[model samples]
Target chain A: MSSERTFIAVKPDGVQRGLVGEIIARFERKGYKLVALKILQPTTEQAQGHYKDLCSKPFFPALVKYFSSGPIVCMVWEGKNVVKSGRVLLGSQPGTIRGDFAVDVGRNVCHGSDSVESAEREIAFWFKADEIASWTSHSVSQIY
Target chain B: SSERTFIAVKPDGVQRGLVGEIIARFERKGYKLVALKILQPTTEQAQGHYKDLCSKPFFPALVKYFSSGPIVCMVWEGKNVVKSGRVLLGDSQPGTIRGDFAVDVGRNVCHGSDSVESAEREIAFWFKADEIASWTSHSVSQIY
Candidate 1:
């Protein structure tokens, strides 16, 4: 069976900190296929909509502020159990991003959907349906 | 004569267009690329190969990542290569693939056999029984 898909974005903080290649390499090394990717800054309206679920939270405004602070890496990752597997690889330990890079919950350097449903929603929020593709389907298996 | 060793650039290296650069590094060092391929790894295969690390905290995660991407597995023959390969990889130093490219200690950029025993196991794990070849018998007049 094929793997699930998910949305992972390296926030402006991550980009400014020079973690783009480092982060991409992690997902890549793990054998996840890159479906779609680009460097972009979310529009103010899009940011508002993207974080609308967090709008009522106390840090809602700060979430929008930091996400739009600079260019962010937007990508679609594909692989088995990628949604959960990606998180595990990312390490949930507090000393990780929450521990090292982000003191404020609002400034987390990356984001991953909690479920397949969320992945679909976020993918649409960030990309058009046709933009993503299954390039690996035809290529010879080149990994081990 | 030093024994031969195995090494590879995972699929991430190919996607990022680092295949030539990676090969160039080894070639410049006077190592022979006796075997090479871009291939997908089976789940069971990845687990067995990385079995030595199975009990470590990161074992499961490592397997998932290593198997997640397509890797460029290879067998290289050279003098004192197993140890020398690691040194050439740089002390996980910033200038080295690990230091410059990898961020997490667990997710270092490349993998190399630590000894002759490991070199044998890894080589068999990825190559056909008859695929290994030797060039030492060739007549070459140039030597530094």
Candidate 2:
């Protein structure tokens, strides 16, 4: 199975720590192809919607604040098991993005959409179809 | 201070050509790339790495799989890197390494040190002072 896609974001702290390359490279290494990539300051609407389930958490407001405070690197990755693997390659532990590089929970340095359904919604929210590119890479065939 | 962890992109990841992609994830996050190399371990080396496999079903396969090709062995250094390595690599959920590329527990893509003491031993076994780059990233004024 192939042609699957997932969304990821290098949260503001990730950008501030110069981790855009770090984050993007994970998916690239897993042999996941990039469909679209960009940098942007997330809006309140996007932030809130993105973290809807977390709204009940006390840190929710702070998350919104930090996400809007700076720029984030946004991307859509394509390939088999990307939605799951993107998060894997990115790593959820503190020693990963948030722990090794961050001190504040609000500053967890990256985000991967929860599932294919969530990925589609976030990808649509962040990028237009035209902004997403289609191309081929020899590595994918060789890797997977 | 920069904490250290031993890790590897297993045969599968190397076969897929992900050495740089995995390394940059730590490098960009301000983790020091302490040492790196490509080598196909002998069964003895595999035993040394997986000594505690409990005669697990995957154990035999790991013995062969780890030796089948060259693997990207490395050490990444940062604060709490050991604990972080665990979280980054664990779980059947997002924000983890195994959750993404893994189809089964047996064939997941990489290996991260289980503990600081474990990493220290692994590093000593696989590396020497000469091969390690033991320096912090220049831009890490804010990373730690």
Candidate 3:
């Protein structure tokens, strides 16, 4: 079956905070499947390209700086309704990533694509079509 | 404040989609994933990885299986992670990965370094210094 996918990045703060596995665990346990993942030291040019839509925002410069400061984990997760559900998995509730590990907006530990359109755009921006693997998880029968 | 171990989801494991579950098991046990990636092993890489077992009768087949497809490699850090990782791999206990999903020794779902000495060597063999990140997880205070 075809599944929805979303882009999820464990930003530098998240990497610096050692929350990559924890963040990944949340999505895994919630039934999303990891289709692709990599750790990258983003260049300023790469960061600028990724955040091009926010180029005019006041914090754009600093945003780019912090994002490209260190290695960040870029991932693509697939599952039904993942684009929307992925945000819920990282929401500002007590059990969520932001709620549990973050306090400041500027230092939020992770980023999730807000909508399916953005998910498609952001995933394409960070990964090549061949980079994403397609496979069936053992628990697929249970998850759906 | 601890040791680290090298672990990998074997090619069959990756083909069977056990990567996320294997990762989740370690994460929930409080081990931090320091580095991770998915790659297709070259025959030369596979030969180097299992050089210690080169004299074994099954070594050739082992290398072929390992290099047959993409596998997930990881570095996990925590107290006694090397020993604990082997235990968690569960060889064949009902709740363990192999116990739950595997049927034969030839296709064990995963591999964990057997000792701290070997763990260090394998980690260095698979990952560069820059690939392994050092960071603190908030739950460390409670886990340790």
Candidate 4:
């Protein structure tokens, strides 16, 4: 089985706009499987670790505030090229969500791990072992 | 009390087994799935859908490709879904569907109408009134 994995999250704005399914659907369509998914209001402490790279920035407080604002759909997608493809599908443009869905970079609709190493830490910070399932299936092909 | 829009996971997406992932995103977002089906598009249906692109040199290939395999057709309903959907999908970045999982000019993992007008046209061209479903669920409250 392909072991590649990536972490992604739908921001509060994204969830409120009903983009959660759209986000997950995009990855699934790419052949990535949902290793984990949940609706949770991220805590400030978790946001700090989840965004450790940005912890030193001036906007760190605001960043944590926003993530903690409401419920978010956090997901772990697995498959070949999951990290790269996940980043690609989670594009940085305002219209990337579908069209003009994600605007303000600060309050954009989603977040994804930038690299495999980060993905490891992110997955651990956000999920427990039982939270992630070990699963397999047929009809699997990798043009994903 | 909600806007409606149509989208399709193209042949490539279907081949990749992304239908479930796609559907889940919309469902989590609180958008209503009003219509759905999986089928190969008729040549005429494909042509009609891309009729506006008929003048292009690549139109024939585009039509052929779209009709090449089974696609998942969906009608979503919610606040500003048409506009919001695009944002959720991204415009032209590698992170968006077209940007991340696409090849060639007209081939991508998915297709979405660019406007309310286009969505109306596409929906009518691809779905019948009876094919569209409407309902309410408590999930709507989560997003509101």
- Residue pairs with colliding backbones in model 3 are none
Per-residue lDDT, model 4, residue B53, is 92
RMSD of each: 10.1, 9.2, 16.1, 10.7
Worst 10 residues of 2 chain A by lDDT: A91-100
Report the C-alpha lDDT of model 1 over A89-144, residue by residue, as the tens digit. Answer: 44434323433456555556788788888988998989897888777643224332
Once fitted onto the true fold, the runs of candidate 3 whose alpha carbons sit more than 4 angstroms away are A1-144
What lDDT does candidate 2 reach at residue A5?
87
Q: Rate residue A39 of model 4 by lDDT.
A: 92
Chain A only TM-scores, each candidate in turn: 0.84, 0.85, 0.96, 0.90
**How far is A37's C-alpha from truth in model 2 (Å)?**
0.5
Over the full model, what C-alpha lDDT does candidate 1 score relative to the true structure?
A: 0.70
Best by DockQ: 2
**The 10-residue segment with the lowest total lDDT in model 4 chain B:** B98-107
Compared with the true structure, what per-residue lDDT tens digits does model 1 show for residues B23-48? 77777777777788777777887898
DockQ of all predictions against the true structure, Cα-based: 0.05, 0.13, 0.02, 0.11
On residues B1-144, what C-alpha lDDT tens digit does candidate 2 reach at each position? 577899998887776655676676666556777788989999889877887784787787779878877888888888888887776676465445555445445557788988888898888888888998856567677885
